[PDB]
Amino acid sequence: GADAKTVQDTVTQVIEQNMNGIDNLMYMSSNSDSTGTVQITLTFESGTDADIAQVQVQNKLQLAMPLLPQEVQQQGVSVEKSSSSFLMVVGVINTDGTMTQEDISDYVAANMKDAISRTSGVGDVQLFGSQYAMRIWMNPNELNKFQ
Amino acid sequence: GADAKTVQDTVTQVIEQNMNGIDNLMYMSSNSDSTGTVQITLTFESGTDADIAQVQVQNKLQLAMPLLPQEVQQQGVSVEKSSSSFLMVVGVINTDGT
Amino acid sequence: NEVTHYYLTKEKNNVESVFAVNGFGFAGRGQNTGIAFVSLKDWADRPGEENKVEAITMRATRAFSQIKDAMVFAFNLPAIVELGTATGFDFELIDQAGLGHEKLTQARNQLLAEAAKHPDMLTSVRPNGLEDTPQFKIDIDQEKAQALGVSINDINTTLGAAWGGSYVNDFIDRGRVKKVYVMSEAKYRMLPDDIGDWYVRAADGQMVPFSAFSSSRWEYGSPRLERYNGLPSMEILGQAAPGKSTGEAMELMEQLASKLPTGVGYDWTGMSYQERLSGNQAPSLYAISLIVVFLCLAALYESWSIPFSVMLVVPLGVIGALLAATFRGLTNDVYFQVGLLTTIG
Amino acid sequence: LTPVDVITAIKAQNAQVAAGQLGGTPPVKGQQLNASIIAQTRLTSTEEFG
Amino acid sequence: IAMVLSAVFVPMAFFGGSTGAIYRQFSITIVSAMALSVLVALILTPALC
Amino acid sequence: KILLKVNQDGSRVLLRDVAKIELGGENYDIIAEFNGQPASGLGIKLATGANALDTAAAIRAELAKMEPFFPSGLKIVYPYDTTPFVKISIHEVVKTLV
């Protein structure tokens, strides 16, 4: 729900200010988008084993955590290690076509996301849909009527 | 707070996908008891350095620690290495009985 | 969908399926960007040189230029997804004085216009950032809200829950925990006018509209912000002119860096930083290899003059490699270098 | 007056609030505009603080 | 021949940067092959001949 | 039937009278299609050190084993794959070697 101004001025600045003392940090770059996303990439020197760098980055994020707003804390901050763009993409389709894309996405998320992480050699998995969530769509007219 | 089914479906099913970023990994198994205690054990292959695995487990459970509701923040989890044999047990007694 | 239709009907014998994804993009992630993967058939069914991916991409982008509304680029994957386009660079402007946002964009525009006056040295010098876009600006009158008796926290949570959504708690559907969201109806958050359609309850049982104590206007602003090393930055791409080395363009780039307004510094990121950090070590490595080879040869023989007879045979083998490379139209890449190495060996 | 009132007033009127978007997902068919919304911004001057 | 080939191929392995990896790959894959081939030609072939 | 308010005359207005409750998604900003037909892919990222041929055959076996636990009409396609390329390249190299 926030623009670039809010996400930069409430999320990015605290993390940038509380991220000193990391060894063998070559450079960094932070991007803030109008949709409400903040992405910070820290690139280290060649040949450095990545696990200790990841754990140090996570430790600094843990130190900076309490200063962030409540909503971003509830959503969840993610720290990982980047890799190649895409290795392979598997799509799920249905010939019947009687039902919408949300059903396919929720099925793939609920019954396949956990299983794919099991095989060794997969850094992370991103999904091209949304998992089922129960939505309450308001109507202002009833709110007017019943106060 | 959570009964058998709720604590069954809210902890292990959510932390299931968190366990991805550790190589040489075999499995994980979770138990939940009526007393209110949950215990999740993670097993790797014989030869991985244990300390890096433990710290990786911690920083990867930090992925969904915010994702789970605030109830998991307050209680306080304990993650550590686990053996299977008591090394030695020393008891203390009072002969006075007072 | 027009891309999908064109691919499936004018390229039936070359492409097998098209996977179209909307809302991901590569330069941004908003609602105005999209990508599409295209896979070809089996290689056994595509004879000739007119069915290669290179022979497909330029036909696609030539036939797609007729649309004057959108910007569509069709290409094929780089050999390595991490780094590429060595002849290019990733020059960056950094703010070192806390000037603001308009000043940085104005400096970038000045640099772009002033670099546009060197067409024989710089080619395709373009930014990879999105220009400023309009947005809505709504101001709540604190004094009026206090006078009417509506708390500011209530107004903020009402607006946020209505037009931004809100995550409340979790529930179990079929043995799994799923989230619960609260949001206004789609047909009630499209236009500015229905800003006045929301009512807020006051202390004394009175409903007041938003427009009673609010104002709004339009303002231009950036939708994507970039910071380098903790300071605001604007990244600019570019390419070297054909027939000219990047080193020749480096002195030009620093000469252009020298005449910018105060408080605007420069930096290099990406492959440019790697190129600068690597330094000039190839000639030194060649010289040390030359010396080691001389010493080893003089060790194998006895006299100091005999090794020269073997040592000065290099150009005879080198001439063939360059002749073949010029005849075919090759390029000086790693395979060519190792070919020279094995031939001299 | 009391210091608690001062702290409450400072907290309430120096906060950043998200206001959502115009024409966000899921949209209604036949829409031609899509822009962001600005609600509030933290103070940036001593006179503004006064 | 073995020492000359080693002297001409080994120093390429010492290149730094991202290109250093794909250079050391080739340098090792030729140096090891040459070192083994010289030894094999020294030991095995005379008996077979 | 979530109770919201009773007013003064016992109206008993529930959540379905003031809003519409359904089961959708958290976000709608990404939509994918495959020759026009709706679909939902799965982006996979490789680890720093991992096999190409391996770690993929296990995926195939797992998908085949989970095939019975699927509704009618549900199938999988591969709009992006690299394994055949490495296979043919290795085959060509060994062919020219022999």
PDB file of N, CA and C in Angstrom, chain C residues 190-275:
ATOM      1  N   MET C 190     -11.439   3.402  -8.232  1.00  0.00           N
ATOM      2  CA  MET C 190     -10.898   3.634  -9.565  1.00  0.00           C
ATOM      3  C   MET C 190     -10.690   5.107  -9.883  1.00  0.00           C
ATOM      4  N   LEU C 191     -11.584   5.982  -9.424  1.00  0.00           N
ATOM      5  CA  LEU C 191     -11.503   7.387  -9.789  1.00  0.00           C
ATOM      6  C   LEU C 191     -11.274   8.267  -8.561  1.00  0.00           C
ATOM      7  N   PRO C 192     -10.727   9.470  -8.747  1.00  0.00           N
ATOM      8  CA  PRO C 192     -10.588  10.393  -7.608  1.00  0.00           C
ATOM      9  C   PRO C 192     -11.912  10.819  -6.994  1.00  0.00           C
ATOM     10  N   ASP C 193     -12.985  10.894  -7.788  1.00  0.00           N
ATOM     11  CA  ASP C 193     -14.238  11.467  -7.300  1.00  0.00           C
ATOM     12  C   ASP C 193     -14.795  10.665  -6.130  1.00  0.00           C
ATOM     13  N   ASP C 194     -14.794   9.334  -6.232  1.00  0.00           N
ATOM     14  CA  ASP C 194     -15.314   8.508  -5.146  1.00  0.00           C
ATOM     15  C   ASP C 194     -14.470   8.600  -3.878  1.00  0.00           C
ATOM     16  N   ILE C 195     -13.400   9.406  -3.882  1.00  0.00           N
ATOM     17  CA  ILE C 195     -12.786   9.840  -2.627  1.00  0.00           C
ATOM     18  C   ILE C 195     -13.850  10.364  -1.673  1.00  0.00           C
ATOM     19  N   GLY C 196     -14.837  11.085  -2.205  1.00  0.00           N
ATOM     20  CA  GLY C 196     -15.887  11.630  -1.367  1.00  0.00           C
ATOM     21  C   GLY C 196     -16.972  10.644  -0.986  1.00  0.00           C
ATOM     22  N   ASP C 197     -16.872   9.390  -1.422  1.00  0.00           N
ATOM     23  CA  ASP C 197     -17.912   8.408  -1.145  1.00  0.00           C
ATOM     24  C   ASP C 197     -17.703   7.662   0.167  1.00  0.00           C
ATOM     25  N   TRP C 198     -16.609   7.917   0.877  1.00  0.00           N
ATOM     26  CA  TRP C 198     -16.318   7.239   2.133  1.00  0.00           C
ATOM     27  C   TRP C 198     -16.685   8.139   3.306  1.00  0.00           C
ATOM     28  N   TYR C 199     -17.370   7.566   4.292  1.00  0.00           N
ATOM     29  CA  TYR C 199     -17.796   8.284   5.482  1.00  0.00           C
ATOM     30  C   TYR C 199     -17.057   7.761   6.706  1.00  0.00           C
ATOM     31  N   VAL C 200     -16.844   8.653   7.671  1.00  0.00           N
ATOM     32  CA  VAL C 200     -16.131   8.339   8.902  1.00  0.00           C
ATOM     33  C   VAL C 200     -16.990   8.761  10.084  1.00  0.00           C
ATOM     34  N   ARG C 201     -17.053   7.898  11.095  1.00  0.00           N
ATOM     35  CA  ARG C 201     -17.867   8.130  12.281  1.00  0.00           C
ATOM     36  C   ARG C 201     -17.108   8.994  13.279  1.00  0.00           C
ATOM     37  N   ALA C 202     -17.778  10.019  13.796  1.00  0.00           N
ATOM     38  CA  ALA C 202     -17.185  10.929  14.762  1.00  0.00           C
ATOM     39  C   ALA C 202     -17.609  10.530  16.175  1.00  0.00           C
ATOM     40  N   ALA C 203     -17.219  11.335  17.165  1.00  0.00           N
ATOM     41  CA  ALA C 203     -17.522  11.008  18.554  1.00  0.00           C
ATOM     42  C   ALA C 203     -19.019  11.087  18.831  1.00  0.00           C
ATOM     43  N   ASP C 204     -19.668  12.155  18.382  1.00  0.00           N
ATOM     44  CA  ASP C 204     -21.082  12.388  18.687  1.00  0.00           C
ATOM     45  C   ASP C 204     -22.002  11.813  17.612  1.00  0.00           C
ATOM     46  N   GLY C 205     -21.781  10.551  17.250  1.00  0.00           N
ATOM     47  CA  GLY C 205     -22.691   9.834  16.368  1.00  0.00           C
ATOM     48  C   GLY C 205     -22.963  10.500  15.039  1.00  0.00           C
ATOM     49  N   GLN C 206     -21.980  11.198  14.476  1.00  0.00           N
ATOM     50  CA  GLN C 206     -22.150  11.928  13.226  1.00  0.00           C
ATOM     51  C   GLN C 206     -21.158  11.413  12.193  1.00  0.00           C
ATOM     52  N   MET C 207     -21.652  11.117  10.994  1.00  0.00           N
ATOM     53  CA  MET C 207     -20.797  10.720   9.883  1.00  0.00           C
ATOM     54  C   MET C 207     -20.359  11.948   9.098  1.00  0.00           C
ATOM     55  N   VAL C 208     -19.066  12.018   8.798  1.00  0.00           N
ATOM     56  CA  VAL C 208     -18.520  13.105   7.992  1.00  0.00           C
ATOM     57  C   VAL C 208     -17.811  12.513   6.778  1.00  0.00           C
ATOM     58  N   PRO C 209     -17.833  13.186   5.632  1.00  0.00           N
ATOM     59  CA  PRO C 209     -17.114  12.679   4.461  1.00  0.00           C
ATOM     60  C   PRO C 209     -15.636  13.039   4.511  1.00  0.00           C
ATOM     61  N   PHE C 210     -14.863  12.338   3.679  1.00  0.00           N
ATOM     62  CA  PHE C 210     -13.444  12.652   3.557  1.00  0.00           C
ATOM     63  C   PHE C 210     -13.235  14.058   3.010  1.00  0.00           C
ATOM     64  N   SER C 211     -14.011  14.440   1.991  1.00  0.00           N
ATOM     65  CA  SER C 211     -13.816  15.728   1.337  1.00  0.00           C
ATOM     66  C   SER C 211     -14.139  16.905   2.249  1.00  0.00           C
ATOM     67  N   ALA C 212     -14.791  16.659   3.386  1.00  0.00           N
ATOM     68  CA  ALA C 212     -15.101  17.744   4.310  1.00  0.00           C
ATOM     69  C   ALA C 212     -13.832  18.384   4.862  1.00  0.00           C
ATOM     70  N   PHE C 213     -12.806  17.575   5.139  1.00  0.00           N
ATOM     71  CA  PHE C 213     -11.572  18.070   5.738  1.00  0.00           C
ATOM     72  C   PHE C 213     -10.332  17.607   4.981  1.00  0.00           C
ATOM     73  N   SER C 214     -10.439  17.373   3.675  1.00  0.00           N
ATOM     74  CA  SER C 214      -9.299  16.917   2.893  1.00  0.00           C
ATOM     75  C   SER C 214      -9.209  17.718   1.604  1.00  0.00           C
ATOM     76  N   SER C 215      -7.997  17.770   1.058  1.00  0.00           N
ATOM     77  CA  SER C 215      -7.743  18.358  -0.248  1.00  0.00           C
ATOM     78  C   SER C 215      -6.853  17.410  -1.036  1.00  0.00           C
ATOM     79  N   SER C 216      -6.790  17.609  -2.351  1.00  0.00           N
ATOM     80  CA  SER C 216      -5.964  16.738  -3.172  1.00  0.00           C
ATOM     81  C   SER C 216      -5.509  17.476  -4.421  1.00  0.00           C
ATOM     82  N   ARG C 217      -4.428  16.973  -5.007  1.00  0.00           N
ATOM     83  CA  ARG C 217      -3.839  17.551  -6.209  1.00  0.00           C
ATOM     84  C   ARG C 217      -3.010  16.476  -6.907  1.00  0.00           C
ATOM     85  N   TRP C 218      -2.357  16.860  -8.001  1.00  0.00           N
ATOM     86  CA  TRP C 218      -1.501  15.977  -8.778  1.00  0.00           C
ATOM     87  C   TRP C 218      -0.054  16.442  -8.685  1.00  0.00           C
ATOM     88  N   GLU C 219       0.857  15.493  -8.472  1.00  0.00           N
ATOM     89  CA  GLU C 219       2.277  15.817  -8.421  1.00  0.00           C
ATOM     90  C   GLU C 219       3.063  14.775  -9.203  1.00  0.00           C
ATOM     91  N   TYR C 220       4.127  15.221  -9.858  1.00  0.00           N
ATOM     92  CA  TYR C 220       5.021  14.313 -10.561  1.00  0.00           C
ATOM     93  C   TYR C 220       6.098  13.803  -9.612  1.00  0.00           C
ATOM     94  N   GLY C 221       6.476  12.541  -9.786  1.00  0.00           N
ATOM     95  CA  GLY C 221       7.473  11.947  -8.918  1.00  0.00           C
ATOM     96  C   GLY C 221       8.003  10.654  -9.489  1.00  0.00           C
ATOM     97  N   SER C 222       9.167  10.258  -8.987  1.00  0.00           N
ATOM     98  CA  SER C 222       9.814   9.048  -9.468  1.00  0.00           C
ATOM     99  C   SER C 222       9.132   7.812  -8.881  1.00  0.00           C
ATOM    100  N   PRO C 223       8.923   6.765  -9.685  1.00  0.00           N
ATOM    101  CA  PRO C 223       8.360   5.519  -9.156  1.00  0.00           C
ATOM    102  C   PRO C 223       9.391   4.472  -8.762  1.00  0.00           C
ATOM    103  N   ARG C 224      10.665   4.671  -9.092  1.00  0.00           N
ATOM    104  CA  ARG C 224      11.711   3.715  -8.741  1.00  0.00           C
ATOM    105  C   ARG C 224      12.963   4.492  -8.371  1.00  0.00           C
ATOM    106  N   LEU C 225      13.460   4.274  -7.157  1.00  0.00           N
ATOM    107  CA  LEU C 225      14.578   5.033  -6.613  1.00  0.00           C
ATOM    108  C   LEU C 225      15.757   4.103  -6.371  1.00  0.00           C
ATOM    109  N   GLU C 226      16.960   4.583  -6.678  1.00  0.00           N
ATOM    110  CA  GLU C 226      18.173   3.783  -6.588  1.00  0.00           C
ATOM    111  C   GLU C 226      19.208   4.485  -5.716  1.00  0.00           C
ATOM    112  N   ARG C 227      19.838   3.715  -4.832  1.00  0.00           N
ATOM    113  CA  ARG C 227      20.874   4.236  -3.954  1.00  0.00           C
ATOM    114  C   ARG C 227      22.103   3.341  -4.016  1.00  0.00           C
ATOM    115  N   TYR C 228      23.267   3.979  -4.107  1.00  0.00           N
ATOM    116  CA  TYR C 228      24.555   3.308  -4.210  1.00  0.00           C
ATOM    117  C   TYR C 228      25.389   3.703  -3.001  1.00  0.00           C
ATOM    118  N   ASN C 229      25.875   2.701  -2.265  1.00  0.00           N
ATOM    119  CA  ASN C 229      26.745   2.913  -1.105  1.00  0.00           C
ATOM    120  C   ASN C 229      26.131   3.895  -0.108  1.00  0.00           C
ATOM    121  N   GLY C 230      24.812   3.834   0.045  1.00  0.00           N
ATOM    122  CA  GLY C 230      24.125   4.679   0.999  1.00  0.00           C
ATOM    123  C   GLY C 230      23.850   6.095   0.545  1.00  0.00           C
ATOM    124  N   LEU C 231      24.053   6.410  -0.730  1.00  0.00           N
ATOM    125  CA  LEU C 231      23.762   7.745  -1.226  1.00  0.00           C
ATOM    126  C   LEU C 231      22.889   7.657  -2.467  1.00  0.00           C
ATOM    127  N   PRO C 232      22.019   8.642  -2.691  1.00  0.00           N
ATOM    128  CA  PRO C 232      21.157   8.604  -3.879  1.00  0.00           C
ATOM    129  C   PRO C 232      21.985   8.558  -5.154  1.00  0.00           C
ATOM    130  N   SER C 233      21.525   7.767  -6.124  1.00  0.00           N
ATOM    131  CA  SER C 233      22.307   7.566  -7.329  1.00  0.00           C
ATOM    132  C   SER C 233      21.382   7.393  -8.522  1.00  0.00           C
ATOM    133  N   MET C 234      21.928   7.697  -9.694  1.00  0.00           N
ATOM    134  CA  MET C 234      21.245   7.500 -10.966  1.00  0.00           C
ATOM    135  C   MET C 234      22.208   6.785 -11.900  1.00  0.00           C
ATOM    136  N   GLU C 235      21.813   5.610 -12.376  1.00  0.00           N
ATOM    137  CA  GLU C 235      22.673   4.793 -13.220  1.00  0.00           C
ATOM    138  C   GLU C 235      22.388   5.037 -14.699  1.00  0.00           C
ATOM    139  N   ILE C 236      23.456   5.107 -15.491  1.00  0.00           N
ATOM    140  CA  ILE C 236      23.384   5.419 -16.914  1.00  0.00           C
ATOM    141  C   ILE C 236      24.162   4.356 -17.675  1.00  0.00           C
ATOM    142  N   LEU C 237      23.530   3.764 -18.682  1.00  0.00           N
ATOM    143  CA  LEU C 237      24.189   2.797 -19.545  1.00  0.00           C
ATOM    144  C   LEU C 237      24.754   3.485 -20.783  1.00  0.00           C
ATOM    145  N   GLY C 238      25.529   2.727 -21.546  1.00  0.00           N
ATOM    146  CA  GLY C 238      26.119   3.248 -22.764  1.00  0.00           C
ATOM    147  C   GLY C 238      26.898   2.161 -23.471  1.00  0.00           C
ATOM    148  N   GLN C 239      27.322   2.486 -24.690  1.00  0.00           N
ATOM    149  CA  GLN C 239      28.089   1.567 -25.515  1.00  0.00           C
ATOM    150  C   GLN C 239      29.177   2.342 -26.242  1.00  0.00           C
ATOM    151  N   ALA C 240      30.280   1.658 -26.531  1.00  0.00           N
ATOM    152  CA  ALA C 240      31.391   2.280 -27.232  1.00  0.00           C
ATOM    153  C   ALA C 240      31.129   2.316 -28.733  1.00  0.00           C
ATOM    154  N   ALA C 241      31.647   3.356 -29.381  1.00  0.00           N
ATOM    155  CA  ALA C 241      31.511   3.476 -30.821  1.00  0.00           C
ATOM    156  C   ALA C 241      32.301   2.370 -31.521  1.00  0.00           C
ATOM    157  N   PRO C 242      31.796   1.861 -32.645  1.00  0.00           N
ATOM    158  CA  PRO C 242      32.509   0.790 -33.351  1.00  0.00           C
ATOM    159  C   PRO C 242      33.887   1.246 -33.810  1.00  0.00           C
ATOM    160  N   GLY C 243      34.859   0.344 -33.687  1.00  0.00           N
ATOM    161  CA  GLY C 243      36.225   0.646 -34.060  1.00  0.00           C
ATOM    162  C   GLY C 243      37.024   1.410 -33.029  1.00  0.00           C
ATOM    163  N   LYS C 244      36.472   1.643 -31.841  1.00  0.00           N
ATOM    164  CA  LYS C 244      37.154   2.389 -30.794  1.00  0.00           C
ATOM    165  C   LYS C 244      37.160   1.587 -29.501  1.00  0.00           C
ATOM    166  N   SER C 245      38.309   1.574 -28.830  1.00  0.00           N
ATOM    167  CA  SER C 245      38.441   0.848 -27.577  1.00  0.00           C
ATOM    168  C   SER C 245      37.758   1.598 -26.438  1.00  0.00           C
ATOM    169  N   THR C 246      37.364   0.843 -25.408  1.00  0.00           N
ATOM    170  CA  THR C 246      36.730   1.445 -24.240  1.00  0.00           C
ATOM    171  C   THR C 246      37.691   2.365 -23.496  1.00  0.00           C
ATOM    172  N   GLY C 247      38.987   2.045 -23.506  1.00  0.00           N
ATOM    173  CA  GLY C 247      39.958   2.911 -22.856  1.00  0.00           C
ATOM    174  C   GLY C 247      39.989   4.307 -23.450  1.00  0.00           C
ATOM    175  N   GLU C 248      39.815   4.408 -24.770  1.00  0.00           N
ATOM    176  CA  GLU C 248      39.729   5.719 -25.404  1.00  0.00           C
ATOM    177  C   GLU C 248      38.496   6.483 -24.942  1.00  0.00           C
ATOM    178  N   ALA C 249      37.398   5.778 -24.670  1.00  0.00           N
ATOM    179  CA  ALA C 249      36.200   6.426 -24.155  1.00  0.00           C
ATOM    180  C   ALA C 249      36.288   6.732 -22.666  1.00  0.00           C
ATOM    181  N   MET C 250      37.210   6.093 -21.943  1.00  0.00           N
ATOM    182  CA  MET C 250      37.324   6.335 -20.506  1.00  0.00           C
ATOM    183  C   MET C 250      37.821   7.748 -20.219  1.00  0.00           C
ATOM    184  N   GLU C 251      38.813   8.214 -20.984  1.00  0.00           N
ATOM    185  CA  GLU C 251      39.296   9.577 -20.797  1.00  0.00           C
ATOM    186  C   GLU C 251      38.217  10.591 -21.155  1.00  0.00           C
ATOM    187  N   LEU C 252      37.429  10.309 -22.195  1.00  0.00           N
ATOM    188  CA  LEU C 252      36.299  11.175 -22.512  1.00  0.00           C
ATOM    189  C   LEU C 252      35.289  11.186 -21.373  1.00  0.00           C
ATOM    190  N   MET C 253      35.002  10.013 -20.807  1.00  0.00           N
ATOM    191  CA  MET C 253      34.023   9.923 -19.729  1.00  0.00           C
ATOM    192  C   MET C 253      34.478  10.704 -18.505  1.00  0.00           C
ATOM    193  N   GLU C 254      35.765  10.623 -18.165  1.00  0.00           N
ATOM    194  CA  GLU C 254      36.246  11.405 -17.027  1.00  0.00           C
ATOM    195  C   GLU C 254      36.304  12.898 -17.348  1.00  0.00           C
ATOM    196  N   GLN C 255      36.596  13.260 -18.602  1.00  0.00           N
ATOM    197  CA  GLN C 255      36.537  14.663 -18.998  1.00  0.00           C
ATOM    198  C   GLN C 255      35.122  15.212 -18.847  1.00  0.00           C
ATOM    199  N   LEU C 256      34.116  14.416 -19.216  1.00  0.00           N
ATOM    200  CA  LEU C 256      32.727  14.802 -18.976  1.00  0.00           C
ATOM    201  C   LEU C 256      32.380  14.761 -17.492  1.00  0.00           C
ATOM    202  N   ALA C 257      33.045  13.903 -16.723  1.00  0.00           N
ATOM    203  CA  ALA C 257      32.811  13.871 -15.283  1.00  0.00           C
ATOM    204  C   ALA C 257      33.365  15.119 -14.606  1.00  0.00           C
ATOM    205  N   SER C 258      34.351  15.761 -15.231  1.00  0.00           N
ATOM    206  CA  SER C 258      35.033  16.876 -14.584  1.00  0.00           C
ATOM    207  C   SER C 258      34.224  18.173 -14.586  1.00  0.00           C
ATOM    208  N   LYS C 259      33.200  18.306 -15.432  1.00  0.00           N
ATOM    209  CA  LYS C 259      32.526  19.598 -15.605  1.00  0.00           C
ATOM    210  C   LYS C 259      31.077  19.590 -15.106  1.00  0.00           C
ATOM    211  N   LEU C 260      30.752  18.707 -14.165  1.00  0.00           N
ATOM    212  CA  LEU C 260      29.429  18.623 -13.565  1.00  0.00           C
ATOM    213  C   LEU C 260      29.297  19.586 -12.394  1.00  0.00           C
ATOM    214  N   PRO C 261      28.067  19.961 -12.040  1.00  0.00           N
ATOM    215  CA  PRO C 261      27.866  20.859 -10.898  1.00  0.00           C
ATOM    216  C   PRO C 261      28.371  20.243  -9.600  1.00  0.00           C
ATOM    217  N   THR C 262      28.702  21.112  -8.648  1.00  0.00           N
ATOM    218  CA  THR C 262      29.235  20.666  -7.368  1.00  0.00           C
ATOM    219  C   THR C 262      28.218  19.812  -6.623  1.00  0.00           C
ATOM    220  N   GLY C 263      28.719  18.816  -5.895  1.00  0.00           N
ATOM    221  CA  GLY C 263      27.877  17.902  -5.155  1.00  0.00           C
ATOM    222  C   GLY C 263      27.392  16.699  -5.933  1.00  0.00           C
ATOM    223  N   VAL C 264      27.816  16.537  -7.182  1.00  0.00           N
ATOM    224  CA  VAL C 264      27.417  15.409  -8.016  1.00  0.00           C
ATOM    225  C   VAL C 264      28.694  14.686  -8.427  1.00  0.00           C
ATOM    226  N   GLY C 265      28.968  13.545  -7.791  1.00  0.00           N
ATOM    227  CA  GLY C 265      30.129  12.747  -8.112  1.00  0.00           C
ATOM    228  C   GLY C 265      29.787  11.579  -9.025  1.00  0.00           C
ATOM    229  N   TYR C 266      30.825  10.829  -9.384  1.00  0.00           N
ATOM    230  CA  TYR C 266      30.689   9.745 -10.342  1.00  0.00           C
ATOM    231  C   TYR C 266      31.221   8.460  -9.727  1.00  0.00           C
ATOM    232  N   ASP C 267      30.758   7.335 -10.266  1.00  0.00           N
ATOM    233  CA  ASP C 267      31.252   6.037  -9.831  1.00  0.00           C
ATOM    234  C   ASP C 267      30.991   5.006 -10.921  1.00  0.00           C
ATOM    235  N   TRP C 268      31.673   3.871 -10.792  1.00  0.00           N
ATOM    236  CA  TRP C 268      31.557   2.754 -11.716  1.00  0.00           C
ATOM    237  C   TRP C 268      31.110   1.513 -10.956  1.00  0.00           C
ATOM    238  N   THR C 269      30.132   0.805 -11.516  1.00  0.00           N
ATOM    239  CA  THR C 269      29.570  -0.384 -10.894  1.00  0.00           C
ATOM    240  C   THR C 269      29.442  -1.488 -11.935  1.00  0.00           C
ATOM    241  N   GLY C 270      29.345  -2.724 -11.452  1.00  0.00           N
ATOM    242  CA  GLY C 270      29.165  -3.848 -12.356  1.00  0.00           C
ATOM    243  C   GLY C 270      30.467  -4.251 -13.023  1.00  0.00           C
ATOM    244  N   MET C 271      30.373  -4.583 -14.315  1.00  0.00           N
ATOM    245  CA  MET C 271      31.546  -5.034 -15.055  1.00  0.00           C
ATOM    246  C   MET C 271      32.574  -3.918 -15.208  1.00  0.00           C
ATOM    247  N   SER C 272      32.132  -2.658 -15.204  1.00  0.00           N
ATOM    248  CA  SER C 272      33.074  -1.546 -15.296  1.00  0.00           C
ATOM    249  C   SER C 272      34.002  -1.506 -14.087  1.00  0.00           C
ATOM    250  N   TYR C 273      33.453  -1.731 -12.890  1.00  0.00           N
ATOM    251  CA  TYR C 273      34.287  -1.774 -11.693  1.00  0.00           C
ATOM    252  C   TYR C 273      35.279  -2.925 -11.770  1.00  0.00           C
ATOM    253  N   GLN C 274      34.836  -4.084 -12.262  1.00  0.00           N
ATOM    254  CA  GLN C 274      35.740  -5.221 -12.399  1.00  0.00           C
ATOM    255  C   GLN C 274      36.862  -4.913 -13.382  1.00  0.00           C
ATOM    256  N   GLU C 275      36.531  -4.256 -14.496  1.00  0.00           N
ATOM    257  CA  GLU C 275      37.548  -3.884 -15.474  1.00  0.00           C
ATOM    258  C   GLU C 275      38.549  -2.901 -14.883  1.00  0.00           C
TER     259      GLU C 275
END
